[PDB]
Amino acid sequence: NPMDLTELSTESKLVVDFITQYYQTLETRPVQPRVKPGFLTGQLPDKAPFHGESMEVILSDVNEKIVPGLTHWQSPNFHAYFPASSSNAGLLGELLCSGLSVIGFTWSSSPAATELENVVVDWMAKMLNLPSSFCFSGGGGGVLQANTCEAVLCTLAAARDKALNRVGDDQINKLVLYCSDQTHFTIHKGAKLIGIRSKNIKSITTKKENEFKLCPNDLRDAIRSDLEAGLVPFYVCGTIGTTALGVVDPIKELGKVAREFDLWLHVDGAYGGSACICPEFQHYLDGVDLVDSISMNAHKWLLSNLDCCFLWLQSPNALIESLAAEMVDYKDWQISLSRRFRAIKMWMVIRRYGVSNLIEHIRSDVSMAVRFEEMVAADDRFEIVFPRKFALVCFKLSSEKTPPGRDSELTRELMERVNSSGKAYLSGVQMGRIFFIRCVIGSSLTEERHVDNLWRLIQETAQSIVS
Amino acid sequence: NPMDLTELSTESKLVVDFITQYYQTLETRPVQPRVKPGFLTGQLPDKAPFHGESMEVILSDVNEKIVPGLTHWQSPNFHAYFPASSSNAGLLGELLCSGLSVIGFTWSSSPAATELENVVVDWMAKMLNLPSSFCFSGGGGGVLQANTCEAVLCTLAAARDKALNRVGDDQINKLVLYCSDQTHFTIHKGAKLIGIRSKNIKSITTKKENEFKLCPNDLRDAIRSDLEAGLVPFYVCGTIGTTALGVVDPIKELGKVAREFDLWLHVDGAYGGSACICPEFQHYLDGVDLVDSISMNAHKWLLSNLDCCFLWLQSPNALIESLAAEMVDYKDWQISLSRRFRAIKMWMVIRRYGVSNLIEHIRSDVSMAVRFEEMVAADDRFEIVFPRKFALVCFKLSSEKTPPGRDSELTRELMERVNSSGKAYLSGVQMGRIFFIRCVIGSSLTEERHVDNLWRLIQETAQSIVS
């Protein structure tokens, strides 16, 4: 019997206790493992079992054979990449969503699911303080997705088809997209996906003078240069909080540029967007009225676990018309027919914790990053490569207190020895000539003590090699 | 505190008990609701709460305000669309995956996650008895996705880029895709997504003579007709178990056709693919050696809840080369960087139940559909419009025992009155001139009694209008 209810409630507690013990381990568990390729592949049978096995033997096999070979994103010692903010409400909302197992591709196939997605989308829109034109009650509207690439693909398709409907159906080889050299690779990936040619995905270089922002004058000059070449610009992507540096592009200026040439402006909210529920960061959303579309990942700061990605349009019919084949049918809003009930999990998280708790959780992470930055700045052995705007601190070894020419390779070795120690996991990028470490505060379990321990470990490892 | 562990275990039991009571309701709950647009939208607050609320008040609000406005896919009275096979192991594996919250886009960011995806992919490949060329140990390999449209998009991109690398970079406007008129709309959707022009997505009509299969001779003639027009065929999609009728396309013949013109052959396993773990249905996979790619939805019959979609390639480098920007990095295998740990849930389900239980669950659903077909065939008031191959029975009112010309509209009214009664939910499609009802056995909760009740209700409703 596959749906035995007493067995269901029996094994549910087993799995929940497994998860709680995993969580309590993470203060000790080495974050990133050191294992050999094929360790698990050779350790597991070649074919599937004919018969079944109990739940607790499965869970034991999990905790001994798969857990050690995991990178523990939830560890309070994990400060690399970008957080997978997890909470009790997010986990239990995942469980409830999967228990309902309602797949609502149209309003008729689950009215409540679509209406609850509507209200959650509008809730978040006013939490971020967008104009009415992005709300369902203001003309536009939004949708939940799984990743930012689904939303980016949807906007790219809508923009491409709007352009082609204006200039001609067989003109796809002339469409030109613009983004900065800091834009997430997902933009180039999606542009290549929707048939844009490789030469026409222009990454405009950014300069340290402009804080690596995408300058609108270079955008305008590139646009008219390619227009004099007989090609059709159609898409521009600005970013709030880039991956490597956390750059915020000048949204309003690029909005005026995109309006002047009637280009589709999309805003990758990405990492910084979630933080914009706070009044301090809301200014990073000015010019949003000139924006065609905005996407943002809630699983990067809003404690929803994985996964959930909001996407808001001022003219949603521009998207529905691109993918279709009053009452909302989300079949025409994204890639596939099959959708999950993510709205119930976002609703769960929000009503369980409150805008208050969410605001202050973001503020606590940002404050911890402020303190980490203040600690780096007090050490002449180190250097901020770019001022922090959120919970992202980018730093490296000082060149004055390292041998000539090897400050970057010694920064890389510092990061490697820290990660190999197992006591923490930091990210790091090679921006041409320089290498720098990213420390991202956001692992939910992380408190002040963990940031203090991380800074002390970075210092102790630096003294171990520097001079 | 967002990660309070004692509060986590306290509220987990609340949510689990909520789910178990929901499940036990489904024998009584009217499957499809009758509600007005805006019922939930007006019933919920305009903005998000500043403060939080308890878990049980949330769950009460769920069971009173959202559950009644749901279409209960998990009800044993639900036989429309295609099942969302759910089990205890699938639900608890969803919970465990979300609890681990490990996001592994590369082997380095979670070796165990990638290796376990590898072994699960290979397990399923040998469960379906594919050639070695689709296994990681045979040259090719596979990947887990969320939907069939992600897999279809990946294969379409790989095929398009292979073609363009052969014929020219600026030739996208000449690429031609072929599918039948029974193919799922996701194929046309993805073809439009990757920049194929609308005229070049050719739906070749199928004839009732060929059981609506895609005849390979018409495929060949269309190919050489478009080749004499100076266009580049590049993609052909065959289907095992179509949505409306459950058609199986002649895989091997289309394989030889696609080999002759070096076209990319993709197989939408879709609905029938999952059933192919059974030896009786494995014959529906012959010619699979000539196939470039195969996708199949495990959440349609393999009891994994939602969602999980296997995709196997004979040459995975053809996909990696299309989306990239030994040890496997699934970042280059699909649409986005962010991936979930679906492998752990599939592993959970398989090792908990067994290939034995899975085979026999498929066989029990197929047997129930056999019995439903036998019941329809014994009633002169009804008629099978297409012979059943899986758990899909397509039937309608007999034209001999209805007034001239209105057998189809009376079949539609029959379906409408049954669905409106709330005692069951059946699907129905208008194939040009005829209308017929689809009954799909697969709601997990469904036993023999429910099929008997459904047949009696269909008969009682038919006598209520027929003569």
UniProtKB/Swiss-Prot annotation, chains A, B:
Question: GO: which molecular function terms?
Answer: carboxy-lyase activity; pyridoxal phosphate binding
Q: Which InterPro entries match?
A: Aromatic_deC, PyrdxlP-dep_de-COase, PyrdxlP-dep_Trfase, PyrdxlP-dep_Trfase_major, PyrdxlP-dep_Trfase_small
Can the keyword Lyase be found in this entry's annotation? yes
Which reactions fall under this protein's catalytic activity?
A: L-tyrosine + O2 + H2O + H(+) = (4-hydroxyphenyl)acetaldehyde + H2O2 + NH4(+) + CO2
User: So what EC number does this one have?
Assistant: 4.1.1.108
What is the role of the protein in this entry?
Catalyzes the production of 4-hydroxyphenylacetaldehyde (HPAA) directly from L-tyrosine, tyramine not being formed as an intermediate.
- The protein here is known as 4-hydroxyphenylacetaldehyde synthase
Encoding gene (name): 4HPAAS
